[PDB]
Swiss-Prot record, chains E, H:
Top-level division of the source organism's lineage: Eukaryota
Protein name in the entry: GFP-like non-fluorescent chromoprotein FP595 chain 1
Shown residues in whole-protein numbering: 2 to 62 of 232
Disulfide bonds: none
Amino acid sequence: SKTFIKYVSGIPDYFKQSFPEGFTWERTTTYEDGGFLTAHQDTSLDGDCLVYKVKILGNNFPADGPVMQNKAGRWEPSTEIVYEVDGVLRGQSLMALKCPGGRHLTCHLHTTYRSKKPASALKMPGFHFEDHRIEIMEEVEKGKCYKQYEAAVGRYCDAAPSKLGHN
Amino acid sequence: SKTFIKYVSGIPDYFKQSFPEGFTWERTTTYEDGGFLTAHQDTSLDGDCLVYKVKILGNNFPADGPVMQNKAGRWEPSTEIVYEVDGVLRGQSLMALKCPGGRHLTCHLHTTYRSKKPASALKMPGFHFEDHRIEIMEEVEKGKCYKQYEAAVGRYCDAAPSKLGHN
Amino acid sequence: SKTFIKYVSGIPDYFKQSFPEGFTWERTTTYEDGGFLTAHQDTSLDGDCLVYKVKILGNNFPADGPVMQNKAGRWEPSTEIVYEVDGVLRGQSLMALKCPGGRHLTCHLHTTYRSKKPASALKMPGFHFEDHRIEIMEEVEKGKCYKQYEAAVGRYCDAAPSKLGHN
Amino acid sequence: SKTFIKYVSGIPDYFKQSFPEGFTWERTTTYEDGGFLTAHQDTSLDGDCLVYKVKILGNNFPADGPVMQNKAGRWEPSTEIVYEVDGVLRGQSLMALKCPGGRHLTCHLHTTYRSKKPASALKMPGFHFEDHRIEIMEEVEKGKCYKQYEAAVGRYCDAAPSKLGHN
Amino acid sequence: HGSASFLKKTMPFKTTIEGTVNGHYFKCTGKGEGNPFEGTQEMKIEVIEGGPLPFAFHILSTSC
Amino acid sequence: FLKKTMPFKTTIEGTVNGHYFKCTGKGEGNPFEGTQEMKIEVIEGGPLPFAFHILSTSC
Amino acid sequence: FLKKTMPFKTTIEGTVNGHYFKCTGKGEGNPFEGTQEMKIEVIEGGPLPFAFHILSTSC
Amino acid sequence: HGSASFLKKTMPFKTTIEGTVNGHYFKCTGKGEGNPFEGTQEMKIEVIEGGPLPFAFHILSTSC
Ligand SMILES: [Cl-]
Ligand SMILES: [Cl-]
């Protein structure tokens, strides 16, 4: 849901620039214990309301693993690297489930974001980081009903600055 | 299309054993240059005719690569390892797409095969190899009509025998 | 050279706690174009001076790639996730070479850090981030002589805070 | 120990062709549970005797896994794909370590073989398969003395023939 | 835009998710709202087919 | 339930790099001999903007 | 330069998960028949604290 | 420790690196200094065998 990002330090916003047409994204997430979760998404703007259409194919999750056992815990915050390739944006991140009792199960996200505008109509951002805080705040039911919050920030590596003027 | 395999050496046939109910398969294929192709398939038997229903999500293929440039050559034959996990069958293989410039573009298939029969109704095969020869016999119409042949054999490693009585 | 990290927010310092004995680390870095770079390192303290002993094995770098062509550019800053596993620390990060003319070539680091003290003598840090800014500030020669700077910070995800009190 | 291969079907023997100078190989083996084993090897001929010099760096093996617990069973036979890249030979294979509990712990080998002869002195083999049957014949002394057998065959996919005249 | 007084403070969204994980088919709908420039959002997701999910919802978090 | 020669039919729907497509196909093979052939037709999203080869193992 | 039966010798040095070890080995095989056998001895760092199997392809 | 006045401000280090990349053997030595608590450091690396390196130094940056 990449329309909701706070970009700092003047980093251009590929997602907000893509409206009113919108954008798509595509991703495979590879889990360290062998699972794969692949998705394709379309984002459109219908009047004042954003509309998401998502297709998912997941496979090879181990029967004895946290995912198929529904013993996943909660996501740690994560940081994505985002950069231009082939006139579109690529993203990659490492995410980690903090499982009950302390072990982390990690995964690697491989994403392409595709504006519906031609690249010539867009100011492309340089290489930067996108922090994502994802919290499943309410398990209303099962199984069946969930409330999820996200905060996201697009930024450079400010904590360890360049001695040469690089971002 | 796993119903069409010649099994030798007494290896049980997980696929033929699954009828009339049928089976499903799920797969993620990772390409060495960053592409992913994920699929889910259902196999059923409608009277006399086998019926396949396939869903595909592919992503992250490089714009400059042989796949998106449509400048692939042909598949070498490949050999899959097939073994029981989680009461179903797992397969993995390396495939190699011959491409212009003497290139081979390789990929790694990660498959789960799931009978619609209960595992207790089945004689599960031991670890073995499945050779697949896949050939495009004709590109009948550019980007629109193909004819494809496959020959497949389930076997043990007969060329290099054990000294300990192992398959 | 993990002794030189600024840890904030009270995060325990696994490396400084390991002295006077020291620590080792081990890593495989996997490049997106097929290279692997594996290393083992020992860190010891000799009076007032730290002493590093490093063994390297690298392979499968493509002859036509930025590495073997010596056309790598410069590293982007990177962020490692660091967390306890098996009573030691694991690290993973995504790094990216900004090649001349703009393309990034990425890689994935997989590290284990091993104190020479028993885990029972150490305050283990929780899951956190370690930013690394690496700058090859002087190519004095070739080929043959390099000056490299690094700044590193151990921190939590402060830019996108939890609404639940999580780090 | 690649000098010991039976080649069929007229496939050129890159290894036997490399004498008296010899050859080297380099490899990273990735394990599905996170371990990496990297090696470099030099093969020379000292009078009548072949001489191997091997350097190994392994890391990230899980403490609770079959490798570090020393609770592995045995290797299934494996099949490597072997083809020319960058004027040398590349190999890749999937191997499967049978382990207690009906587990197979699989890994992916990424190899480069480098003749010490110039590529112009060599008849390079086309894409083919190399089957390797590796067996521990005896654990003579726990953790200290092993006897190991290998049988290897370089071949094409004879079980599933082409309809287009391909190997 | 001059100042933040001229930006949309909040924007709603709706979602439909359909998929198959380890052979298990499911469909979801969701509704949410966020603050585009503050970078915060929340949504409610409901499973309408294939519930209760036989796997951890967490694998769907980055997709909804 | 199986015969020495069997027909099959397939429907395929997918998206690759943002490109939507749909195919149908029809084939025949000899299940016990391990051989088969089929004709695949792209019915939506043709001509495909990518190599058909990435679909070979999915037909 | 090759014969129908050839001997070989190896020296191996490594570190795995922080564990240093060294081996020597001696074997014989039939290069043209594709068969070989060897005895590997751990000379430093024994008994190995990991499965020998991870060294099989390196002997 | 009471205050930063009681911490070591800087610490020196020395390094020896030996390896093989794509069949190419090399050895390096290095010397540097850093500020342990400020998290900054710099070193000079010299190739003593196998120079000039036939590959980008960058692949060695995280090892030196
Ligand atoms: Cl950039
Ligand atoms: Cl933690």
